Design a protein around this nucleic acid. Structure first.
Length: 1166
RNA sequence: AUUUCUACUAUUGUAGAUUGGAGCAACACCUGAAGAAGGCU
RNA sequence: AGCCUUCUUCAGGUGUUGCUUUAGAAAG
């Protein structure tokens, strides 16, 4: 059950020292330097205003771009620092050589390197930078003037560009400008020869040199931090712990980019559309057979998309991709750009039939577009004359459905409901009421009385009665409005309920998903080309005598000195502060070293240390034919000798990695051995004065903080702190990835400094890798290949649980069967392998004890019940003060009404499904607050009492679906939100202040934590039975019937009506977003693949990433029940689930039967 | 009180859970608009 | 001319669901 897969694990750590009086002081030996560096980090940490700022920035970067384009080639003026010149040697790909000056004027570099001037490489790099930022300035100019035109003309508000592509275009443009302007603001590009008096003819350079580009840099950084801030966290730095990974150059995704364009068949699509006019591409897409192309799996997904719905290629990827594929094919870039632009051009059949009528055809338009036009304009035709091609729309709908549409009951019912809505709209037109309303009343009555119901609707007659009563006599407006809203819901959900059309929409789900994934991956890997500086800091972890750990990060652009050597030169062996840094190698680095070696005459490759003088290096065979030369034995032997006896293997001391290539007879074996053994945590020491000189020199001393490692009695209770102190043992199996990103979160106003949101919080997010050292392991990139192919993943699951069932064949296993519902969020039953109901779980309780000494107060746990079939809903694993882990019921201990009231008693309940119920009620109120706003303000009309206010809510909000109807309504929070909405609608009716109230609250965190309690329970039981256990779950993927949505009264279809309907998600929407089925599934399965003992990771379910990896697996056969085994988890069919006397409830029986259905076929199968 | 989430306590914190970043698709509603159709005055 | 409804489209927001990509040293 050992883990054979590589795993990543982000361990986030705070970097802001809390200074509360009730927080233990930590990092005291370097406290002054921590507080100094906090002020350093505080000083550089900060849709119509955004675009005004973008237009201001675009004007400054156009001015800067046009000024820089006339300076960069005047090489007698530019001078570079030595660190900048070396980074230019790496970036412009030449040899630095020997420069014996701190300031290198480009009037030097007249020497030759590989057939060119040395300064010409710098000038050509800057010229390429100018060209790329000019192209991105053109793209950003197009988007910016488009969005500005949409802004300052309220008529044209529908022409806004995509904001994600707008933001990402500015991020690429900001990177490209920043590569030039950051050395200008830092002085790494300076102009020393400006002292001579030539202002009569060279004054334009004088305005360039003394201009403050710090202002432009900070304004661009302001926009970047505005764009990059997601969730309140702004990226601060990207620190490396391995200094060879510093000064990193962007990854080349050439093979990955070319594979997506191959998958898109984009080259062949531009082949059949290049040279066409913009109207001829339109006629090509018009004359395409929509239905045969849409279902043709071998077509382009781009073509298969534009024959169902007009879906244009996104702006950023389309301009990166047009320039990408225009180059090697010799195409004109404008022609391929025109082809890419005309793909997915929106066309309206209604607007086109309005303009002209002859030559019109619904086959010219995509399936959804023409279907919508035909269905809507034919529904209007059954009660009035409509100017549209009536028989053509009939023919189109009959071709789609195979039957005579406008004779079907469903389409007729849609036409009646649309006509009813139209006549109610005319009769409601209060400003322009008709002179003769009687004939509209007659029309409504006639349409309601001649209507025929296609199926059963329970409440339709009530809606009809209320609407007819309102129009005829005027009884009620509330019931009439509710009835009209429900009829609108029915009519909206009726569109296409006649299977031939839901199939096409379900196919478009995957087709548009592949379209979006491929273009998003292409955009992410084309944006990678301009990620010039990934690493900004080089850092070490500094440990002192109290085992506190710091982060001494130093900017790589901070000054003209070498900032990799600055930290490392100050390391000693007998100092007081132990420093750590990662010494590691990967197959990624190896393949970067082998392929990029150069054997040209004038070239001095930077990788000549890595490569020895054997026979195995042949550049053409490595470059053009790598995947065939990697299997040749001469290259394997050459790579082994390059890793053993090269210059780089003795300079970097690669013999300390403990490599052994006596078993590696292949290149994949070499890469695996490198990825397995190559990790050492290089421990050195540094002094107090060295840290003082570095922090005073501008470096940042971020203190690594969490609750456990900065407490008084520093015992590791968290798994992140346990992993943190497992990393610094130097063990190979649990590594520290050298790269990690520091971010910051600005304080929220209205929050005190005693809380983390009223504090500027810096977070270090370390990545820790689990690399199995016992033999062959599967790396992360091999894993994503298996996750992306369902046949490979099916075979992997089959071989994994073949391995598992051999282990637990002749063992005395138990079976852990879990039911899921709403009455109990999960209930668990443990069975013996013969089916005997086990379970002697002691259920404890907490009571807080106030000791005489105040800091010695603690929780004492006492046993309260003995339960056998557990209700996991109110349980959480608790560790007592004696170290024993017990099961504690949260509901047994009351909680206090107001937090931080030590002298008051506890009088409130602590059920978790009550929390879910309250959040669902809040989300239902916020939904009706958006859609039915005045109805929501009517709830507090005359300052109601709580009972009559609850009665008022019961006419607006649906119940939860569990417990009594409106059991635990959050009235004191609901009335506060409605009063806040009344206040916001008063004093100006601002929309953002409304959106802070009316928008739905996220439900994922509450139910994630509530499920995490239960996952801890299941982990405790699984480890209790010595991991020789089986787990059984339902297959809750099929919805046998319909449901009503929690938000509206909307009907949620079954799986029969729509094959993509999942029972868990249908029930989630039934509860207004508070379903805990898939959360329990995903959290249990993500727990079971990483179950961690003292120092070893034990894996009990196969490797998976998505939900289509654990669903859509091979089910076992030749048994009683249909079960899908996923490691130790069996997803049995839920059909007929709901010491035999241990069953007391209706769902204890369900959990016992879920366990028993797995017991039976584990008996039969093995 | 939190790396963060959840539940707490007021114990210089507690217990469980914790892989983070960028997006993509479908849906729901809101907001800003456009097009067409029918219709009202 | 004003105005209402209806369908579709566009942009954003917030949710719900899934789904990918990325996360160690890239010179002909």
């Amino acid at each position: 059950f050992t883990n054979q897969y590589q795993l990543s694990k982000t361990l986030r750590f705070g970097a802001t020292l809390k200074e509360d009086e009730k927080k233990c002081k930590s990092h005291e030996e370097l406290k002054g330097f921590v507080d100094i560096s906090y002020e350093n980090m505080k000083s550089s940490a900060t849709e119509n205003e955004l675009v005004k700022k973008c237009e201001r920035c675009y004007s400054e970067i156009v001015k800067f771009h046009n000024a820089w384009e006339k300076i960069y080639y005047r090489t007698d003026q530019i001078a570079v620092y030595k660190d900048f010149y070396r980074q230019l040697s790496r970036k412009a790909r030449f040899d630095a050589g020997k420069q014996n000056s701190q300031l290198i004027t480009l009037a030097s570099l007249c020497g030759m390197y590989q057939g060119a001037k040395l300064s010409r490489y710098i000038t050509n790099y800057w010229k390429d930078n100018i060209t790329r930022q000019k192209s991105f300035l053109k793209d950003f100019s197009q988007q910016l003037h488009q969005y500005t035109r949409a802004l300052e003309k309220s008529d044209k508000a529908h022409t806004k560009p995509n904001l994600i592509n707008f933001n990402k275009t500015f991020m690429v443009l900001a990177n490209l400008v920043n590569e030039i302007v950051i050395p200008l603001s830092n002085g790494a590009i300076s102009f020393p020869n400006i002292s001579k008096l030539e202002d009569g003819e060279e004054s334009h350079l004088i305005e360039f040199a003394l201009n403050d580009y710090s202002q432009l840099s900070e304004l661009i950084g302001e926009l970047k931090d505005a764009i990059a801030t997601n969730g309140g966290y702004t990226p601060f730095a990207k620190v490396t712990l391995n200094h060879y990974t510093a000064e990193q150059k962007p990854h080349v995704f050439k093979n990955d980019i070319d594979a997506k364009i191959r998958e898109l068949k984009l080259i062949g699509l531009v082949e059949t559309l290049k040279g066409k006019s913009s109207e001829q591409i339109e006629e090509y897409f018009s004359n395409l057979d929509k239905f045969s192309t849409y279902n043709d799996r071998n077509q382009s997904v781009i073509v298969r998309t534009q024959c169902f719905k007009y879906k244009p290629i996104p702006f950023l990827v389309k301009h990166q991709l047009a320039k990408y594929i225009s180059e090697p094919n010799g195409w004109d870039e404008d022609a391929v750009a025109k082809v890419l632009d005309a793909v997915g051009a929106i066309r309206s059949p209604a607007h086109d039939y309005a303009n002209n009528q002859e030559g019109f055809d619904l086959n010219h338009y995509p399936i959804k577009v023409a279907f919508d036009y035909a269905w809507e304009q034919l529904a209007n035709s059954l009660y009035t004359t409509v100017t549209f091609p009536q028989e053509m729309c009939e023919k189109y709908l009959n071709s789609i459905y195979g039957c005579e549409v406008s004779k079907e009951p469903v389409f007729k019912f849609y036409a009646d409901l649309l006509y009813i809505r139209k006549n109610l709209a005319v009769l409601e037109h209060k400003n322009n009421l008709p002179s003769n309303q009687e004939e509209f009343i007659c029309k409504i009555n006639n349409t309601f009385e001649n209507i025929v119901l296609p199926y059963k609707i329970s409440q339709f007659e009530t809606y009809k009665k209320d609407i007819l009563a309102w129009i005829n006599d005027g009884h009620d407006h509330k019931k009439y409005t509710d009835a009209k809203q429900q009829l609108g819901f029915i009519r909206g959900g009726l569109k296409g309920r006649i299977n031939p059309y839901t199939k096409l929409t379900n196919e478009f789900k995957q087709i548009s998903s592949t379209y979006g994934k491929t273009f998003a991956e292409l955009r992410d890997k084309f944006k990678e080309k301009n990620e010039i500086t990934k690493i900004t800091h080089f850092g070490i972890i500094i440990e002192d005598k109290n085992r506190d750990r710091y982060l001494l990060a130093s900017e790589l652009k901070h000054e003209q000195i070498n900032h990799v050597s600055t930290i490392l030169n100050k390391l000693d062996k007998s100092s007081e502060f132990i420093t750590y840094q990662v010494k590691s190698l990967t197959s990624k680095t190896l393949i970067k070293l082998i392929k990029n070696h150069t054997t040209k005459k004038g070239a001095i490759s930077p990788y000549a240390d890595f490569h020895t003088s054997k026979t195995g290096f042949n550049k053409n065979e490595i470059e053009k034919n790598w995947d065939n030369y990697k299997r040749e034995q001469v290259l394997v032997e050459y790579v082994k000798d390059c890793l053993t006896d090269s210059t780089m293997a003795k300079n970097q001391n690669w013999a300390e990695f403990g490599w052994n290539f006596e078993k590696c007879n292949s290149y994949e074996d070499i890469e695996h051995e490198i990825d397995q053994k190559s990790y050492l945590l290089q421990s050195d020491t540094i002094s107090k004065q060295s840290i003082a000189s570095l922090v005073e020199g501008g470096c940042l001393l971020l203190p690594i903080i969490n609750q456990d490692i900065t407490s008084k009695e520093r015992k590791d209770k968290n798994q992140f702190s346990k992993d943190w102190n497992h990393i610094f043992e130097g063990s190979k199996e649990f590594r520290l990835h050298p790269e990690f990103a520091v971010s910051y979160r600005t304080p929220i106003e209205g929050y005190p400094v005693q809380k983390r949101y009223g504090r500027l919080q810096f977070v270090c997010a370390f990545n820790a890798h689990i690399v199995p050292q016992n033999g062959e392991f599967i790396n992360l990139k091999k894993q994503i290949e298996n996750f992306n192919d369902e046949d490979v993943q099916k075979r992997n699951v089959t071989e994994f649980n073949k391995k598992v069932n051999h282990a637990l064949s002749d063992k005395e296993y138990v079976v852990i069967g879990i039911d899921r519902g709403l009455k109990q969020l999960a209930t668990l039953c443990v069975l013996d392998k013969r089916g005997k109901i086990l379970g002697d779980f002691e259920i404890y309780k907490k009571e807080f004890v106030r000791a005489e000494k105040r800091s010695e107060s603690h929780w004492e746990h006492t046993q309260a019940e003995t339960r056998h079939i557990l209700d996991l809903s109110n349980l959480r694993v608790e560790t007592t003060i004696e170290g024993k882990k017990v099961l504690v019921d949260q509901s047994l201990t009351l909680v206090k009404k107001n937090r931080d009231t030590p002298d008051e008693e506890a009088t409130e309940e602590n059920k978790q499904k009550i929390k879910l119920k309250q959040l669902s009620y809040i989300r239902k109120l916020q939904h009706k607050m958006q859609t039915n706003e005045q109805d929501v303000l009517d709830l507090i009309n005359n300052e109601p009492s709580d009972e009559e206010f609850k009665k008022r809510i019961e006419g607006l909000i649906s119940s939860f679906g569990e417990g009594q109807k409106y059991a635990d309504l959050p009235i004191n929070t609901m009335r506060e939100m409605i009063s806040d909405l009344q206040g916001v609608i008063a004093r100006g009716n601002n929309q953002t202040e409304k959106n802070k109230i009316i928008e739905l609250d996220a439900a994922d965190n509450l139910k994630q934590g509530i499920v995490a309690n239960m996952i801890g329970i299941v982990n405790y039981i699984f480890a209790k039975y010595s991991y020789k256990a089986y787990i059984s779950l339902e297959d809750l993927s099929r919805a046998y019937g319909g449901a009503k949505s929690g938000y509206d009264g909307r009907y949620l279809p079954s799986t029969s009506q729509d094959e993509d309907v999942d029972f868990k998600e249908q029930q989630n929407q039934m509860l207004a977003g508070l379903g805990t089925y898939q959360f329990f599934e995903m959290q249990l399965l993500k727990k079971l693949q990483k179950i961690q003992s003292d120092n070893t990771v034990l894996r009990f379910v196969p490797a998976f990433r998505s939900a289509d990896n654990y669903r859509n697996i091979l089910r076992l056969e030749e048994t009683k029940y249909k079960s899908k085994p996923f490691g130790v988890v069996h997803f049995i069919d839920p059909k007929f689930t709901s010491n035999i006397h241990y069953i007391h409830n209706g769902d204890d029986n369900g959990a016992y039967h879920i366990a028993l259905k797995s017991v039976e076929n584990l008996i039969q199968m093995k």
